[PDB]
């Protein structure tokens, strides 16, 4: 056993080593292992992505045309967001610019999609973690609607209704069926709801698998389809026509109705039954204001997202702002710049790729896809992982670094950022919540604090679009219909050899897509995803990820039944097939 | 009354599968969960993890052994001896073989566990490999698609439980109900290819008229689906009435067909 | 003036003729007249249908397979029933027997539209009778919540609900655009609903208007449309595939699950809103338990429907039984027959209509509708009648009578003749309901009775809709596809000569059409619908119709104010294109 | 800000179109009477009955005089003197008369209202006339089928509010954006009618493939609507996608050229 130190911590890989493989209620495969000393509390954490699939690979030799269909399979949870990055990358290659419908258009696909994918979190993959299902069936329904009234306005809140859905728990359960419920970690003492938000958050749950299909709709209408809609380079395949012959072949006046509709319930459902159920969670579990801090008060990162002036992604047009704090000084937010070969580098010394040499860090121009498993001793066999050896590889993500500093990402670090920017909008927002739970500014950097700015950031989505439909209505209003760029459609249009970046804020972080084209096909496709930072295995220095950062020095009441580790995992939403492409 | 015993295992694969079965209109996914099956082991949504969820795996499959359907989503890799999937320390294939070994019957979600889809690629880093090339013992239903249509892969349930058997299928195990015509032979834009009023670059008058993709690459011509009849999103919408072209999803290697902006 | 006495009434047109036309709140174009005495009660009542197209002239000529879609358009409110009368006349005539399937998916048809028909009735067109809209602008949310909660298990119901609602109308009617509610008889002594139970039926009111346009959607899958649906003789055009190639070109397993949704979502809106809405307008509305029995105690009629046996349509394969009660005999429900000329019969005397003899009543088979415009000596000219001369012609309505009776026909007709004849489930539904306002079975027979059993038909046809689902389902499960019969398709097939009656039981009440088909082509089509019989002008007896008795001895508050003319003729629901057709 | 008044008047009709409004999916017409219009004047779901209702109709037309729009659903009948349809006992052609003279724009809903529809069918009992025989100094704007489409009225009121403009019309005086193009333009079965593949009698194996309805009588091919794109109930269906023929009910004179089920 061995001990180092590095950002403050002391990891240490004595005692009693424990296995959480599969990790449950994330997209994809995902092995964490931690020690603990003789207080049960976490003295090391290892990060590790169990899968691998290499689309950085399959890319090349593609038209660069076809790239987005390829990439967006990258993840179907964060579905649309790599084909924006994608059309983004290859814009930015040939130098292309999108006429402003289909600048609009493509918010709208993002906000939505920020919607869709926060709401689904918080309830079906997260809330398990907060909410004690089998406790809601000793709940009192006449005390359930009391508790609901006290917090929302949302109608859905009557004794009966609330009495009907612990029914059909009750029934549910009564066959030893418990499907999604068995063997889970009921009873737990970190379990702190009383059981009325027991059965109000069940309820929730519920209504929230129900109404996610609808939020879709909207990617329906401009993409088709949902899961894994369509777009084109030059801008959107969903041409509009209003009032000439033939709308009925294209986004005409219906179409936009049925996208207003689908915002409206959108914002009512975010508004009245996630962001209650959020601060509820917040108000009966304080103490999760400090524990999984991790980097959060160290280091985070944002590219930036939503440019609200058509082909700007400088700081006056994304809405949605990028910057870097490192070493815990939020008073100088850093710029970020993607093409700075200094700045974002992966390294692979701990992860199963081949470097020419393992020591350095490589920016994504420069990055080399070259899969190598080779775990070293492991307790077991290559075939037989018992123990990961964290002293050499033991992942399929790549480790990313800006400016060789281990950052974090997603909702809690672009709060941050904005925050310190000092977006009025934010810091109003931040400063309510935190007062409304009587908590100082720090306790949002926690796993309690990720779960109420992804909830916080659902609301600022569902704001944005409606903006951003109006802006197209405005646009349609003055005639201007245009939905695509096609003068360089035609590949004899591109230079014979460039490069582009495509990046924006998918609903776990900082995305990028570095590509280059020669010769009309893509000869280099090079993707830094959310989760690749947060899950990040250590890098030469020795210099933990998000992940494991945020897991350490954490309290376990029953080191058998992972709650405190799944809910740190968890509140920063993993998306390994993301992570490791 | 009790419900059919459901084990929903994942591979290599985007989990849009899952995604695509949550947005199910009618019945919602809800109602499939509470009352028409027992979803007994899913990675994606099931409270419990690493042990737990080990102990479960093996319960289910030793005490409904024999019983249970087998759904798959996502494909086993071949190389780095399997572990480009990893479940629970072990190749991911493993466990696909003893989830086969007990399940009456195996459906296979999706381009992936159907066929291979995006990581199946030239050059196939990862040599992922669909489900009926490593079971071979045991009906397998191929529900193709990146995903497969939401309302489809609820209709496919509730056939299998109101109906007590397996849904007839193709030469290549996929069902006539959803897969046995093209979508070039339901497709709306059909009157425009039969005329020659085509779209020949984006956001041109034709296409805000609705004229037919076949020349901007639409591959309906050659693709099983029901996306131009059932449509997707609760009838929203479908790929082609929203102005892109078929990419060909539901067909065995479309990936390594061409550019879908060709012919 | 002139004093008679018919059916226990003293008809008397002495004194004050106020007139109410237009009828609002109705399907089509009525005009009411009456008598007040010195003491406001009305001593005459005086029904008039102001419209006429001639369906029965148009379809002479016309194929017999076109007949449904011609007579569909007799009404979009009762939609459909008059396709399903039509195709049910032409296989009488022709004897065409139809497949299982085909009649199962028609019973659904016919209990869908029940379902709608009422929902919408109830809310939209009756429901502002005995709902203070204005008022509800004084209720306090608490206390809605509180009421509503106290009713149904209805989720909706909480006080930030109500006070949406409340917001919602208060700032409609801020801008003094009161649009529908603009010069009602708001305030009206007769309002008795308290503040909170107005707020409840007006969220319920809007809740209504939503959800209707959801029931239709069953029509939609089997009929192609809502409003009007098609058909055909021999079955239904929906055909059946579910596990054969091509089946995303038929009714398959997904288009079957939209309708089970459909069906489980109607069920319960009417059993969780519109039914304890009913009672609560019978708790707060007693009174209206003893006002317009008109001829509910005398005299009611229903040809029965729902056939369970495929061409089956006598009494052991009917679900909503057949009868006739005259004389207030209600333990001699007699049988009715649509071809024996001695029991269905129109007279013309008092409308305007020519007849070779006036004096005697035609059944349908030898109908004759031959228009004649003769108002003869009213107030005013006959293209501005002040008042019309009920002593004359005086409406488009013909007059039926049932073996020279007059009859009233629709909910509370069928539920009085199922009561008696036995029918379990109206008998236990009925006492239930009397039992819970602490009234006698008697004050069924009255105003609030028609509206009492119009949200208990809803109710019935919401389960006889899982019925019918079910049993289609068993059918598809045992091999058995078929959807229509085709051996007598072709018009060389058919009897040179022949003659059918279609019946059912429509939303308002009794309807049948008698058809002659001779050389392929129709001869004869009459129709007799269920507003003809209730709206009905006088035989040559002076016998007055349902509505003329209904409006008989009741007393109005403020003379110029009709609210208690509008309470009792919207109770049967006035179809006046119906009516005339 | 004020909402667009509108007065809705009702000749000789079935309400068919009043029902299709009630429908609608998006906006909902809660929103729309709600939000979007003051619909001022409707005999169907107005409280005011009789002299109130007249009172209505009077104070509106004058106070808002030359700022109205008029939606006319039914037609006036000549024969009779036009007491075959009777209002406030003088003939519906007054009513229409005076309500037409302060109207900015009438917008004719359904085929009664642009054409003549089901009363005016051979031999037209009581000489039932389209509303732009009658009114001949103002805009009309016709909305037709039996009924209209919903989410088509629906979407006509909304353009007319957003964007303070009437819809642009064909030459007939129908909206371009739903009246443009032929059903048989979009029609999902196209591809069977291309082929030669048609249903010939009903419930055979080509019906029970969605084949093609012409040689069942559909009238598709020269009737100009939107039910086979936007479709019926939020999408659900269409007359032919249920297995009907189209009727050809948006057009003028459809009820007399010929059996609904021959060419
Ligand atoms: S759009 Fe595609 S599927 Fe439709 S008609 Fe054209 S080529 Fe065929
Ligand atoms: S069904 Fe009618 S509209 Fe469709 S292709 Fe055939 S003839 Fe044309
Ligand atoms: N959000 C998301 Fe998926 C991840 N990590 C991407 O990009
Ligand atoms: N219900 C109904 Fe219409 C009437 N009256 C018919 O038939
Ligand atoms: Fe639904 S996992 Fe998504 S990639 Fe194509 S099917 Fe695979
Ligand atoms: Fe909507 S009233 Fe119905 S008949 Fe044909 S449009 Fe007329
Ligand atoms: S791309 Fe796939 S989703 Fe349907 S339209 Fe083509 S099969
Ligand atoms: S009958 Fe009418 S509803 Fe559409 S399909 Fe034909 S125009
Ligand atoms: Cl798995
Ligand atoms: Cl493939
Ligand atoms: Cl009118
Ligand atoms: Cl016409
Ligand atoms: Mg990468
Ligand atoms: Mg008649
Ligand atoms: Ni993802
Ligand atoms: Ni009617």
């Given amino acids: 056993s061995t001990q180092y130190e590095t950002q403050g911590y002391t990891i240490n890989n004595a005692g009693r080593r424990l296995v959480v493989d599969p990790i449950t209620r994330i997209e994809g495969h995902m092995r964490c292992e931690v020690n603990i000393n003789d207080q049960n509390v976490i003295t090391n954490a290892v990060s590790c992505g169990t899968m691998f699939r290499g689309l950085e690979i399959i890319l090349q030799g593609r038209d660069p045309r076809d790239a987005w269909a390829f990439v967006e399979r990258i993840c179907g949870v964060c579905t649309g967001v790599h084909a924006l990055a994608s059309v983004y990358a290859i814009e930015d290659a040939i130098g292309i610019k999108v006429p402003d419908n289909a600048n609009i258009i493509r918010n709208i696909m993002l906000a939505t999609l920020w919607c869709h994918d926060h709401l689904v979190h918080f309830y079906q993959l997260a809330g398990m973690d907060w909410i004690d299902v089998l406790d809601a069936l000793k709940a009192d329904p006449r005390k359930t609607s009391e508790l609901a009234q006290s917090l929302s306005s949302w109608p859905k809140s009557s004794p009966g209704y609330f009495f009907d859905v612990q029914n059909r728990l009750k029934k549910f359960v009564e066959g030893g069926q418990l499907g999604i419920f068995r063997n889970g970690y009921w009873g737990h003492p970190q379990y702190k709801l009383p059981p009325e938000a027991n059965l109000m958050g069940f309820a929730h749950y519920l209504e929230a698998l129900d109404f996610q299909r609808e939020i879709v709709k909207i990617h329906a209408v401009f993409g088709g389809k949902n899961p894994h809609p369509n777009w084109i380079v030059g801008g959107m395949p969903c041409a509009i026509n209003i009032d000439e012959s033939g709308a009925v072949g294209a986004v005409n006046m219906e179409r936009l109705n049925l996208v207003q509709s689908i915002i409206t319930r959108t914002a009512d459902f975010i508004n009245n039954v996630m962001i209650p159920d959020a601060l509820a969670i917040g108000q009966f579990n304080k103490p999760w204001s400090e524990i999984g801090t991790g980097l959060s008060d160290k280091c985070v990162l944002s590219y930036g997202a939503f440019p609200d002036i058509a082909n700007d992604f400088g700081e006056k047009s994304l809405l949605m702002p990028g910057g870097a704090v490192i070493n815990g000084d939020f008073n100088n937010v850093l710029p970020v710049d993607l093409v700075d070969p200094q700045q974002v580098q992966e390294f692979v010394d701990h992860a199963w790729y081949r470097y020419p040499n393992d020591q350095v860090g490589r920016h994504p121009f420069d990055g080399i896809t070259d899969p190598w498993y080779n775990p070293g001793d492991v307790k077991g066999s290559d075939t037989n992982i018992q123990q990961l050896n964290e002293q050499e590889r033991y992942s399929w993500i790549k480790a990313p670094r800006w400016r060789g500093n281990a950052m974090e990402v997603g909702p809690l670090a672009r709060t941050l950022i904005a925050y310190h920017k000092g977006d009025a909008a934010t810091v109003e927002s931040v400063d309510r919540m935190m007062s409304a739970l009587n908590l100082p500014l720090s306790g949002i950097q926690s796993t309690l604090g990720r779960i109420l700015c992804r909830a916080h950031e659902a609301q600022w989505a569902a704001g944005k679009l409606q903006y951003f439909f109006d802006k197209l209505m405005t646009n349609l209003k003055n005639g201007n219909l245009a939905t695509a760029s096609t003068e360089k459609w035609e590949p004899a249009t591109w230079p014979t050899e460039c490069r582009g970046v495509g990046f924006t804020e998918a609903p776990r972080g900082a995305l990028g897509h570095w590509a280059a084209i020669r010769d009309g096909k893509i000869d280099l496709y090079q993707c830094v995803v959310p989760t690749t930072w947060n899950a990040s295995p250590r890098d030469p220095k020795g210099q933990i990820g998000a992940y494991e950062a945020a897991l350490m020095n954490t309290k376990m009441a029953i080191p058998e039944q992972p709650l405190e580790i799944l809910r740190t995992l968890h509140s920063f939403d993993p998306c390994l097939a993301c992570s490791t492409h | ?263």
Wanted: hydrophobic residues 35%; aromatic residues 10%.
């Fill in chain 2, 1 to 263: 009354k009790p419900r059919i015993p459901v084990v929903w295992i994942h591979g290599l694969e985007c989990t849009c599968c899952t995604e695509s079965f949550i947005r199910s209109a009618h019945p919602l996914a809800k109602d499939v969960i509470l009352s028409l099956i027992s979803l007994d082991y899913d990675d994606t949504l099931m409270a419990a993890a690493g042990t737990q969820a080990e102990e479960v795996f093996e319960d289910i499959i030793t005490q409904y052994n024999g019983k249970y359907i087998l759904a798959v989503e996502g494909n086993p890799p071949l190389g780095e001896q399997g572990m480009f999937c990893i479940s629970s320390g072990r190749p991911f294939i493993e466990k696909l073989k003893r989830a086969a070994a007990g399940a009456s019957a195996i459906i296979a979600w999706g381009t992936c566990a159907s066929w291979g889809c995006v990581q199946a690629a030239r050059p196939n880093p990862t040599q992922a490999t669909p489900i009926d090339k490593v079971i071979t013992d045991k009906p397998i239903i191929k529900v193709p698609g990146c995903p497969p249509i939401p309302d489809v892969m609820s209709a496919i349930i509730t056939y299998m439980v109101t109906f007590d058997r397996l849904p007839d299928v193709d030469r290549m195990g996929r069902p006539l109900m959803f897969y046995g015509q093209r979508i070039h032979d339901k497709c709306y834009r059909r009157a425009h290819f039969d005329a020659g009023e085509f779209v020949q670059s984006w956001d041109d008058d034709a296409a805000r008229k609705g004229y037919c993709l076949y020349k901007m690459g639409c591959k309906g011509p050659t693709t099983y689906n029901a996306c131009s009849s059932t449509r997707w999103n609760d009838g929203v919408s479908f790929p082609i009435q929203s102005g892109h072209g078929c990419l060909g999803c539901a067909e065995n290697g479309f990936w390594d067909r061409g550019s879908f902006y060709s012919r």
